[PDB]
Design an enzyme around this catalytic site. Structure first.
Site, PDB file in Angstrom:
ATOM      1  N   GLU A  64       0.713  -1.372   0.160  1.00 24.85           N
ATOM      2  CA  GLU A  64      -0.126   0.356   0.139  1.00 24.85           C
ATOM      3  C   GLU A  64       1.223   1.311  -0.164  1.00 24.85           C
ATOM      4  O   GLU A  64       0.527   2.265  -0.912  1.00 24.85           O
ATOM      5  CB  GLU A  64      -0.977  -0.124   1.075  1.00 24.85           C
ATOM      6  CG  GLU A  64      -2.130  -0.682   1.313  1.00 24.85           C
ATOM      7  CD  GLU A  64      -3.131  -1.169   0.228  1.00 24.85           C
ATOM      8  OE1 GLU A  64      -3.139   0.519  -0.288  1.00 24.85           O
ATOM      9  OE2 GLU A  64      -4.116  -1.482   0.061  1.00 24.85           O
TER      10      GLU A  64
ATOM     11  N   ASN B 151      -7.073  11.063  -5.085  1.00 26.73           N
ATOM     12  CA  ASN B 151      -7.680  10.700  -6.361  1.00 26.73           C
ATOM     13  C   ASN B 151      -8.853  11.312  -7.238  1.00 26.73           C
ATOM     14  O   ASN B 151      -8.613  12.511  -6.397  1.00 26.73           O
ATOM     15  CB  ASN B 151      -8.676   9.141  -6.178  1.00 26.73           C
ATOM     16  CG  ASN B 151      -7.898   7.886  -4.684  1.00 26.73           C
ATOM     17  OD1 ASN B 151      -6.649   7.752  -5.533  1.00 26.73           O
ATOM     18  ND2 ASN B 151      -8.107   7.483  -4.335  1.00 26.73           N
TER      19      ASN B 151
ATOM     20  N   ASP C 177     -11.826  10.882  -8.050  1.00 27.41           N
ATOM     21  CA  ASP C 177     -13.118  10.668  -7.726  1.00 27.41           C
ATOM     22  C   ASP C 177     -13.194  11.361  -6.228  1.00 27.41           C
ATOM     23  O   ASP C 177     -14.377  11.775  -5.533  1.00 27.41           O
ATOM     24  CB  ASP C 177     -13.522   9.810  -7.331  1.00 27.41           C
ATOM     25  CG  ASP C 177     -12.734   9.133  -6.011  1.00 27.41           C
ATOM     26  OD1 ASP C 177     -11.942   9.463  -5.254  1.00 27.41           O
ATOM     27  OD2 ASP C 177     -13.224   7.385  -5.806  1.00 27.41           O
TER      28      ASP C 177
ATOM     29  N   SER D  71     -11.906  11.399  -3.483  1.00 29.85           N
ATOM     30  CA  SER D  71     -11.489  11.029  -1.807  1.00 29.85           C
ATOM     31  C   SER D  71      -9.514  10.726  -2.249  1.00 29.85           C
ATOM     32  O   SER D  71      -9.573  11.308  -2.815  1.00 29.85           O
ATOM     33  CB  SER D  71     -11.858  10.056  -2.135  1.00 29.85           C
ATOM     34  OG  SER D  71     -11.046   9.046  -3.023  1.00 29.85           O
TER      35      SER D  71
ATOM     36  N   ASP E  73      -6.587   8.630  -0.975  1.00 26.29           N
ATOM     37  CA  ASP E  73      -5.940   7.236   0.384  1.00 26.29           C
ATOM     38  C   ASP E  73      -4.740   7.787   1.373  1.00 26.29           C
ATOM     39  O   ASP E  73      -3.941   8.118   0.965  1.00 26.29           O
ATOM     40  CB  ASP E  73      -5.300   6.249  -0.596  1.00 26.29           C
ATOM     41  CG  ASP E  73      -6.311   5.973  -2.156  1.00 26.29           C
ATOM     42  OD1 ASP E  73      -7.916   5.767  -1.661  1.00 26.29           O
ATOM     43  OD2 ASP E  73      -5.579   5.758  -2.747  1.00 26.29           O
TER      44      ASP E  73
ATOM     45  N   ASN F 143      -8.972   5.142   2.833  1.00 29.18           N
ATOM     46  CA  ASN F 143      -9.687   6.376   2.309  1.00 29.18           C
ATOM     47  C   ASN F 143     -10.810   6.953   2.239  1.00 29.18           C
ATOM     48  O   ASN F 143     -11.685   6.905   3.598  1.00 29.18           O
ATOM     49  CB  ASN F 143     -10.759   5.474   0.478  1.00 29.18           C
ATOM     50  CG  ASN F 143     -11.196   6.355  -0.513  1.00 29.18           C
ATOM     51  OD1 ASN F 143     -12.045   6.887   0.128  1.00 29.18           O
ATOM     52  ND2 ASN F 143      -9.918   6.878  -1.311  1.00 29.18           N
TER      53      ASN F 143
END
Ligand code: CL
Ligand code: CL
Ligand code: PT
Ligand code: PT
Ligand code: PT
Ligand code: PT
Ligand code: PT
Ligand code: PT
EC number: 3.2.1.17
Length: 128
Positions: free
Chosen positions: A35, A46, A48, A50, A52, A59
Protein backbone atom coordinates in the site's frame (compact mmCIF):
# COMPACT_ATOMS: atom_id res chain seq x y z
CA UNK A 1 8.46 7.72 9.10
CA UNK A 2 9.40 4.82 6.85
CA UNK A 3 9.29 1.63 8.88
CA UNK A 4 11.44 -1.44 8.57
CA UNK A 5 9.51 -4.63 8.09
CA UNK A 6 10.52 -6.14 11.43
CA UNK A 7 9.91 -2.90 13.37
CA UNK A 8 6.46 -2.61 11.77
CA UNK A 9 5.75 -6.26 12.58
CA UNK A 10 6.61 -5.65 16.23
CA UNK A 11 4.47 -2.48 16.41
CA UNK A 12 1.52 -4.17 14.75
CA UNK A 13 1.90 -7.17 17.07
CA UNK A 14 1.86 -4.85 20.13
CA UNK A 15 -1.53 -3.63 18.86
CA UNK A 16 -3.11 -6.99 18.49
CA UNK A 17 -2.99 -7.46 14.70
CA UNK A 18 -1.46 -10.94 14.74
CA UNK A 19 -4.39 -13.21 14.07
CA UNK A 20 -6.94 -10.37 14.18
CA UNK A 21 -10.07 -11.87 12.58
CA UNK A 22 -7.88 -14.77 11.38
CA UNK A 23 -5.30 -12.66 9.53
CA UNK A 24 -1.73 -13.40 10.58
CA UNK A 25 0.78 -10.68 11.28
CA UNK A 26 2.55 -11.22 7.95
CA UNK A 27 -0.64 -10.35 6.08
CA UNK A 28 -0.76 -6.91 7.72
CA UNK A 29 2.95 -6.23 7.18
CA UNK A 30 2.60 -7.29 3.51
CA UNK A 31 -0.45 -5.02 3.06
CA UNK A 32 1.50 -2.04 4.41
CA UNK A 33 4.49 -2.83 2.17
CA UNK A 34 2.43 -2.76 -1.01
CA UNK A 35 0.00 0.00 0.00
CA UNK A 36 2.50 2.57 1.22
CA UNK A 37 6.06 1.15 1.06
CA UNK A 38 5.95 1.37 4.91
CA UNK A 39 5.66 5.21 4.71
CA UNK A 40 3.40 6.72 7.36
CA UNK A 41 3.09 9.95 5.35
CA UNK A 42 1.93 8.34 2.07
CA UNK A 43 -1.02 9.92 0.28
CA UNK A 44 -2.74 9.13 -3.00
CA UNK A 45 -5.09 11.93 -4.11
CA UNK A 46 -7.65 10.39 -6.47
CA UNK A 47 -9.77 11.88 -9.27
CA UNK A 48 -13.02 10.86 -7.58
CA UNK A 49 -12.60 13.49 -4.94
CA UNK A 50 -11.23 11.06 -2.35
CA UNK A 51 -7.72 10.50 -1.00
CA UNK A 52 -5.96 7.45 0.44
CA UNK A 53 -4.04 8.13 3.66
CA UNK A 54 -1.11 6.66 5.52
CA UNK A 55 0.67 3.36 5.98
CA UNK A 56 -2.46 1.36 5.09
CA UNK A 57 -3.80 3.84 2.45
CA UNK A 58 -7.22 4.26 4.09
CA UNK A 59 -9.73 6.11 1.91
CA UNK A 60 -11.56 9.34 2.78
CA UNK A 61 -14.97 8.47 1.27
CA UNK A 62 -16.03 5.84 3.83
CA UNK A 63 -13.41 5.74 6.53
CA UNK A 64 -11.89 9.09 7.64
CA UNK A 65 -12.96 12.71 7.21
CA UNK A 66 -10.73 15.03 5.18
CA UNK A 67 -13.51 17.61 4.73
CA UNK A 68 -13.28 17.62 0.99
CA UNK A 69 -14.56 14.23 -0.18
CA UNK A 70 -18.14 13.80 -1.51
CA UNK A 71 -20.16 11.11 0.20
CA UNK A 72 -18.21 11.14 3.48
CA UNK A 73 -19.25 8.52 6.04
CA UNK A 74 -16.28 8.83 8.43
CA UNK A 75 -16.84 5.33 9.82
CA UNK A 76 -13.55 5.35 11.75
CA UNK A 77 -14.63 8.67 13.39
CA UNK A 78 -11.33 10.36 12.77
CA UNK A 79 -9.85 13.12 10.65
CA UNK A 80 -7.72 11.65 7.87
CA UNK A 81 -4.72 13.58 9.12
CA UNK A 82 -4.64 11.25 12.16
CA UNK A 83 -3.77 8.48 9.72
CA UNK A 84 -0.56 10.32 8.74
CA UNK A 85 0.96 10.09 12.24
CA UNK A 86 4.40 8.57 12.90
CA UNK A 87 2.90 6.13 15.38
CA UNK A 88 0.55 3.61 13.79
CA UNK A 89 -2.20 3.32 16.43
CA UNK A 90 -4.90 5.33 14.61
CA UNK A 91 -4.27 3.44 11.35
CA UNK A 92 -4.34 0.08 13.20
CA UNK A 93 -7.60 1.01 15.00
CA UNK A 94 -9.21 2.12 11.77
CA UNK A 95 -8.01 -1.00 9.96
CA UNK A 96 -9.69 -3.09 12.71
CA UNK A 97 -12.92 -1.05 12.17
CA UNK A 98 -12.74 -1.67 8.41
CA UNK A 99 -12.71 -5.42 9.06
CA UNK A 100 -15.33 -5.13 11.76
CA UNK A 101 -17.60 -3.31 9.24
CA UNK A 102 -18.09 -6.30 7.07
CA UNK A 103 -14.84 -6.53 5.25
CA UNK A 104 -11.97 -8.91 4.97
CA UNK A 105 -8.53 -7.88 4.04
CA UNK A 106 -9.95 -7.91 0.51
CA UNK A 107 -10.87 -4.20 1.29
CA UNK A 108 -7.23 -3.46 0.50
CA UNK A 109 -6.49 -3.86 -3.20
CA UNK A 110 -2.77 -4.27 -2.56
CA UNK A 111 -3.50 -7.10 -0.13
CA UNK A 112 -5.75 -8.93 -2.57
CA UNK A 113 -3.35 -8.47 -5.46
CA UNK A 114 0.08 -8.86 -3.80
CA UNK A 115 -0.34 -10.68 -0.51
CA UNK A 116 -3.32 -13.02 -0.80
CA UNK A 117 -2.13 -16.61 -1.29
CA UNK A 118 1.66 -15.69 -1.05
CA UNK A 119 4.39 -16.51 1.51
CA UNK A 120 3.33 -13.62 3.77
CA UNK A 121 5.54 -14.95 6.54
CA UNK A 122 8.53 -13.79 4.47
CA UNK A 123 7.61 -10.31 5.77
CA UNK A 124 8.21 -11.37 9.42
CA UNK A 125 10.86 -14.05 8.73
CA UNK A 126 14.09 -13.42 10.49
CA UNK A 127 12.59 -10.68 12.70
CA UNK A 128 13.38 -10.55 16.37
CL1 CL B 1 1.04 -0.70 22.77
CL1 CL C 1 3.78 0.98 22.29
PT1 PT D 1 7.62 10.79 9.69
PT1 PT E 1 2.98 1.58 19.17
PT1 PT F 1 1.96 0.43 21.00
PT1 PT G 1 -2.21 -0.37 20.20
PT1 PT H 1 -3.96 -0.85 19.91
PT1 PT I 1 0.14 2.22 21.27
Amino acid sequence: KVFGRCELAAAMKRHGLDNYRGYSLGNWVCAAKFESNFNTQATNRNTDGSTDYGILQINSRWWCNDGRTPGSRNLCNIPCSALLSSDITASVNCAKKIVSDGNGMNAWVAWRNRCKGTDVQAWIRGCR
